[PDB]
Write a protein that binds this DNA or RNA. Structure first.
Ligand code: NA
Ligand code: NA
Ligand code: NA
Length: 91
DNA sequence: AATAACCGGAAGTGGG
DNA sequence: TCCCACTTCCGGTTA
């Protein structure tokens, strides 16, 4: 099963949901969600996973917070903005 | 108030 | 047994 950080990186590479997520500085790996269109992206994550309940941005962000310690994705001090690690970006 | 971003402890689910 | 990688629940805080 695909991991959440990989799902997001794949979307950014494909450009399939450009109204919901975008790079801020791709060289640094920083990216940002749309305030008004993030829920559609969260719904897609839950359906891809086959989860029992509808996925929400809140639940997806709760999962994202767990990456802070291990480092794959860290929150940036800008609205709805996060940063992938160099390791995630290189693989 | 209404709206929304941000936080995380804890218990539940999946697939090893 | 017991960790993976989240998911779900419940709720609090800040702008
Ligand atoms: Na527990
Ligand atoms: Na409640
Ligand atoms: Na604000």
């Amino acid at each position: 099963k695909i991991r959440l950080y990989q799902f997001l990186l794949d979307l950014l590479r494909s450009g399939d949901m450009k109204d919901s997520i975008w790079w801020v500085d791709k060289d640094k790996g920083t990216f940002q969600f749309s305030s008004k269109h993030k829920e559609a992206l969260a719904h897609r994550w839950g359906i891809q996973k086959g989860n029992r309940k509808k996925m929400t941005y809140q639940k997806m962000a709760r999962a994202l917070r767990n990456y802070g310690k291990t480092g794959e994705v860290k929150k940036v001090k800008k609205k709805l903005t996060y940063q992938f690690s160099g390791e995630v970006l290189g693989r």
